Ligand binder design. Structure first.
Ligand code: ZN
Ligand code: ZN
Ligand code: ZN
Ligand code: ZN
Ligand code: ZN
Ligand code: ZN
Lengths: 362, 362
């Protein structure tokens, strides 16, 4: 009755450690990942302190090695000060992350010249990822061409954005992109229900026409990634709600529902949650690692999923068909039917594996 | 000085066993593969007997398990008689191969309706590969759309073909393709030297404009594959020369030369010889497997490479920069500096590995 899948990869998660551990930490976030059929995550650098230099990366790496229950890589974050300073640690990171729209004080870039400096100084063989909305997608693509390298665009959310990327790919430009589940399964039609606080997310929820354009242009989407952005309900409902949805525990159930409805194939799903993440970020295979799912079980997403400390979900009330039954990670049962069974610290930094280093010319 | 690469994959080799073992057998062909930095091969079904039914597949699987020095998967071949009969063994094969142009009596398909029957009966989740030249590419793409599934086009050789595939990808159609090294590094300009016998290959060598279109449209090429088609010199020079070049031992040196010249990146190469073959054919990772190459060593391709029984090469005289120094396959030294060190039978059928089965809905 079950289906065996390879170990799935989420290349865009915010696990909030160090500095935001009331929202989530490595142990709780990777528990959420395992319960969602995810066995490897790439953690974003907008923590407190942000991962914008070698000492912060060193700290975050040890916190993750001690807290993570699944395997991981850590992004470095581009700042207005660190271009040309990351060469020694660059290869130990998942990649470099550029935050090109409204963001946290330390990751804010004031000028496209600062983008150029990062594209010019970051090692040419290592991944660069950009949070780039609307015309920013076009702008960062221009910077990538001027510096003659590739770029990966995070959470594409709009018809405008996916059609621009489509046009770039038609010209042979080296761009890849990812889409998050809330931009495939939620729209403006849901804002009435969510409210202005819970509904706050960046990129914001799109129109029904945005959602339909993403599905119509599935061929253009290289990866699915949750953009797991845990904030507590108190923060989402308060005066200055931060953007973001939790999503690790709901991503695969939502997508398996789409597969069961014929909206995409099982292969389409596995290209976007396994093969393409591997090849874009040069992430290594995980030995004796697999996920068993039940495609027949129908359930309704509750007000909060078991594991994320976010303790809320924007998908509450949606009917889904598909559930993660068992996860085996490197030969150990990591998850069965609502219980995580590997301790904090079982997870490892895949960039330290010999097969996890990005190949490079001498 | 050396560079470590993952285990490379050649998804298009003719190893001639059973029935053509004077041209090559599993032991000699996989020795050639290892010497070329290849650790996994997909063997084509136009053997004698051809692999067009379960008994022939059973035989070929045992011959490969006994003779192969690297890991492998075996293609099934479409015939005018076997549509609807391969469902029980389909999942044990690399995929289904359709020979849509001039070919061997048993793989000859008389009618596009026979193509349709295979697309309709072959399991929808398993790979289909087509030898399709010129307008045949358009025709098989039409059949793929009518049956609403994907197709992979072998050895794209012409500007006409790569631009058609480019246009199909721009419309979001599920098509992938491979290009062989002789269509990137040889042209009509070389036929004077090769002669009409040695120069016989299908698809035939292209014009300089064909070669330049393939390089210009590298973004459209998903895989490199050798189309290793060993024939003895006596056969290539005789009255009725069969088409094909040997290529396993020269593919990587040629491509590494191109990398060293800046014609493509190391990543471009590894996408096309590792990641994309994996994800198109759902081939499993190989544990503790890697290839060490020396990018500085300049040498001239001789009149024949050491291992292929073909005992000739069309690349004789070309200057290359790049050489395979060491291959480790599943923890054992398989190749060092001109010597293969794993015996016939070390190789395994990757479709029998748990991680080597193609995921499918229940
Ligand atoms: Zn991202
Ligand atoms: Zn994010
Ligand atoms: Zn890689
Ligand atoms: Zn092929
Ligand atoms: Zn062939
Ligand atoms: Zn696969």
């Amino acid at each position: 009755k079950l289906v065996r899948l390879p170990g799935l990869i989420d290349v865009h998660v915010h696990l909030r450690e160090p500095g935001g551990t009331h929202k989530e930490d490595f142990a709780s976030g990777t528990a959420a990942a395992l319960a969602g059929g995810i066995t490897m995550v790439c953690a974003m650098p907008n923590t407190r302190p942000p991962i914008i230099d070698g000492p912060a990366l060193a700290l975050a790496q040890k916190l993750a090695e001690a807290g993570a229950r699944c395997d991981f890589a850590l992004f470095l974050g581009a700042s207005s000060e660190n271009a040309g300073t990351l060469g020694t640690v660059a290869g130990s990171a998942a990649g470099l992350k550029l935050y090109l729209n409204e963001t946290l004080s330390e990751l804010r870039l004031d000028s496209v010249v600062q983008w150029m400096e990062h594209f010019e100084t970051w090692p040419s063989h290592l991944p660069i990822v950009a949070h780039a909305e609307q015309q920013t997608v076009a702008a960062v693509l221009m910077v990538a061409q001027l510096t003659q390298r590739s770029v990966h665009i995070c959470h594409v959310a709009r018809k405008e954005e996916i059609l621009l990327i489509k046009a770039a790919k038609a010209r042979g430009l080296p761009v890849t992109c990812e889409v998050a589940p809330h931009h495939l399964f939620l729209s403006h039609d849901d804002l009435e229900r969510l409210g202005p606080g819970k509904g706050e997310v960046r990129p914001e929820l799109g129109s029904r026409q945005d959602v339909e354009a993403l599905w119509e242009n599935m061929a253009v989407i290289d990866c699915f990634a949750s953009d797991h952005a845990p904030h507590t309900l108190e923060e989402k409902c308060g005066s200055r709600p931060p953007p973001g949805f939790p999503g690790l525990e709901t991503m695969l159930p939502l997508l398996l529902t789409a597969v069961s409805e014929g909206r995409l194939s099982l292969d389409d799903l596995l290209q976007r949650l396994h093969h393409n993440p591997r090849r874009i970020f040069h992430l290594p295979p995980q030995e004796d690692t697999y996920v068993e799912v039940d495609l027949e079980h129908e359930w309704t997403i509750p007000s909060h999923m078991p594991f994320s400390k976010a303790h809320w979900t924007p998908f509450e009330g949606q009917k889904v068909k598909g559930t993660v039954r068992r996860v085996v990670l490197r030969g150990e049962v990591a998850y069965i039917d609502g219980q995580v069974l590997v301790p904090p610290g079982y997870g490892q930094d895949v960039r330290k594996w010999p097969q996890g280093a990005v190949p490079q010319l001498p």
